[PDB]
Write a protein that binds this ligand. Sequence first.
Ligand SMILES: O=c1ccn([C@@H]2O[C@H](COP(=O)(O)OP(=O)(O)O)[C@@H](O)[C@H]2O)c(=O)[nH]1
Ligand SMILES: O=c1ccn([C@@H]2O[C@H](COP(=O)(O)OP(=O)(O)O)[C@@H](O)[C@H]2O)c(=O)[nH]1
Lengths: 457, 439
Amino acid sequence: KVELVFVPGPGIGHLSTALQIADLLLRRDHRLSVTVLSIPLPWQPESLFPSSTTTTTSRIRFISLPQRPLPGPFQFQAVFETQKQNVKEAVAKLSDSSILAGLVLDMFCVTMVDVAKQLGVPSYVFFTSSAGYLSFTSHLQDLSDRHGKETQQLMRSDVEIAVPGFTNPVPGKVIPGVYFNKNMAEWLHDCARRFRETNGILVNTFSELESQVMDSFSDATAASQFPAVYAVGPILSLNASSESQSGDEILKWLDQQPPSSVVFLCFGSKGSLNPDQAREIAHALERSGHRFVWSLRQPSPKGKFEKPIEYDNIEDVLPEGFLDRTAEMGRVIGWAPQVEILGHPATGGFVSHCGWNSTLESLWYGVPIATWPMYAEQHFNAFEMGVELGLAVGISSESSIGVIVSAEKIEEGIRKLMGGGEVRKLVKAKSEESRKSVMEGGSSFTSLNRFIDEVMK
Amino acid sequence: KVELVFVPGPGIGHLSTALQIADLLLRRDHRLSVTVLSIPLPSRIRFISLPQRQAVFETQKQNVKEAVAKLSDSSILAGLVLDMFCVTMVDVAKQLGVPSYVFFTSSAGYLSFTSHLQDLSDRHGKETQQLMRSDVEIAVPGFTNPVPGKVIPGVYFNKNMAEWLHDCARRFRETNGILVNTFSELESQVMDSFSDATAASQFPAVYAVGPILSLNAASSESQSGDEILKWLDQQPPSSVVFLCFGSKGSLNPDQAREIAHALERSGHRFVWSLRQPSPKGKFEKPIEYDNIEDVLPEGFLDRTAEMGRVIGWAPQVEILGHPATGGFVSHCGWNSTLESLWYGVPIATWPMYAEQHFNAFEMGVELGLAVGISSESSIEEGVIVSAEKIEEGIRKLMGGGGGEVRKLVKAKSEESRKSVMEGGSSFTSLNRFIDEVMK
Ligand SMILES: O=c1ccn([C@@H]2O[C@H](COP(=O)(O)OP(=O)(O)O)[C@@H](O)[C@H]2O)c(=O)[nH]1
Ligand SMILES: O=c1ccn([C@@H]2O[C@H](COP(=O)(O)OP(=O)(O)O)[C@@H](O)[C@H]2O)c(=O)[nH]1
């Protein structure tokens, strides 16, 4: 018996992405088995595994780790730190019954690389952001450790950073804003240090999207300067409630609209809009003239790092008469069925926060994106997709890291997105490349095979 | 761009197969390009005919060296894939600093056997010829059963031919890897034997990457073949015995009359590929008989007119894949063996030339998948197989209402399908080869 142990990152999004690649690995090598270790959050996994076939399910096991006690920005980090001993024991126990081919860790979970080192087991990272961001975050840690450049000092409008694999200088203004906090800067640098200790890094991208970055990693690996990096994506989650029923209503409305005529606006799992920003969007949407599906959520009260909620009364928040005047032009919704909308033939553009899964989803369906970065590494993602790759346009977002984007600037971005024609052509060609990369013979298909072959040595 | 250069061997069973694995490799990794160098006889795949000048191959060494050097100009020469008969080019690859590989189109068991014969004749001075006796048994790595000296290929009787074959086996050991047209579940003990030997740094890596099969303009043999398939469409499932003897097999009149007696007495439905040896030496294609009604027993074609069909060259894979076909009297060439297994058609063995006597031994005695017809050796010329022995072989093939060998063949057939699909043994073995090539 030969086992890979997965420790997914927090959230059903990260669980789902991890289980998609777990299924892929099991289908690509019948000798492989997988055990998934899930970590409880003190506030079901088998459901998200796409297989329905006993040739595959007989080879995967799911274990929930024993819940643990302990007394913020480091909340999830602390829970995973309390679970290291449980992971170590679970992994040690499994290795009594199997050849332990490796511990596969979500990039958030790389504190567990220590556990693999202590047991003498190979470690691998499942890196769920872009290859370019892997290069950027590693280079920031390297500058800080080897050249004494503390990251806070680079976070300036007059600073440019030479990132391996990038033609364009990377502005210090797109360093993720959380690096200004010294505790969090050190945590992220330490993640990057741990990446370098592993036996290989799976990245959710395809090499034709990020070819110069992937070449830079290939060179570094050949010089023993970095682990092997495997571009194996796009790994996407493409397959009762009333939020699911409002989703069918939107799709039904989308069915009656003309092809590529609807602008979709959606801002990820933690994004939200304050009332004044929402009113500026509304004004811009009404003035733009294009059909729209607008996912609109309010920030959680008493908790900026809580999950966003829906607006109780959108009629009191939005401009007077907006919903009446736009009743046949567009729809406003809460949580959205995003992939169904992006894959719908009526959808013509995507105003996106540029989270990496939203970026890959829009690329997969060939929908051009107008960028509106908000948190995490979204500002860098918008720079890579816009300035470096030329696949996206910006939504007049000069502010990069409490400044509102005016209706004039939003309408200017929608005009570029929908009125340009050259970018849409580049997005369609890249979309075709994304579909072929994961098919037989494609770059991500063969890179996944190469990873499996390394693992099975 | 990364190039693999193939030098295939002669004959349908060697050349068609090399083109199939070249096509498979090109489909399986788009980073790959393939050039095929064709040795004459007396979007990403390229064919080169080498200029015309057994020892055919050695006169071509310099043309091969030069074509390979010229390709190495606009591409990364990942390696040279050679047929088992072309491995004199291992020197060319060595001289040019390029990895060499063998694409071995016979069984892994035969790879072990021919390598062991070379090992015995290299240490001990005794020639292989002195083992080709009825009271000789050979311990071949990977075989539970001792291998009779009777099934050493007959060509080993010639001192010069045996030495050249030993030279081939010696050169296999010098390559970077041997790809074999088999799947590990078919020959698992042999493949374990190679894995042990490679791990002890005693043999190149051996990749079981098959079955590699040729399943695929208007012609007259195309037309007769189409007639056969239409006739098969009208027969009950597993009701027809197919008889076919490879690209060089043929039947003399007395042997053909014994087959005709057996078929008429057995009462089974049949498709019988009947060809006579070319008067122009066995180094040319067999041909149909003229006026077959004057060759076969009197009235045979009249009495069997609704029971079966006699043809020349046959659409073999189409017949083996047809649901009416229930059994295959076969010369046990390795491609025929793989094709019949793929379609789950049990074989009754009638070895004739090359390594077929060994293949029949491996499939029958060692693996239990085939049934034997008679007991002739690799060096017995002209011994007629009686109608009675043929009848008994066909009874075992078609009977049981019994069906125990058919059950093993069906289960082995399913294993052959799975081995080359996503995740199977041969799928991942080919990936390991592709990885080595791309490294
Ligand atoms: O209303 C929404 C918002 C987001 N998503 C999905 O949630 C994920 C968002 O991930 P991304 O990496 O883009 O951003 P994050 O949530 O990590 O900031 C994607 O799969 C979206 O399709 C969704 O289905 N509905
Ligand atoms: O009448 C015939 C005889 C042979 N074959 C094909 O020729 C090949 C024979 O290869 P094998 O290795 O069995 O024997 P060989 O020709 O090398 O003796 C196989 O692909 C058969 O399907 C065919 O199509 N029709």
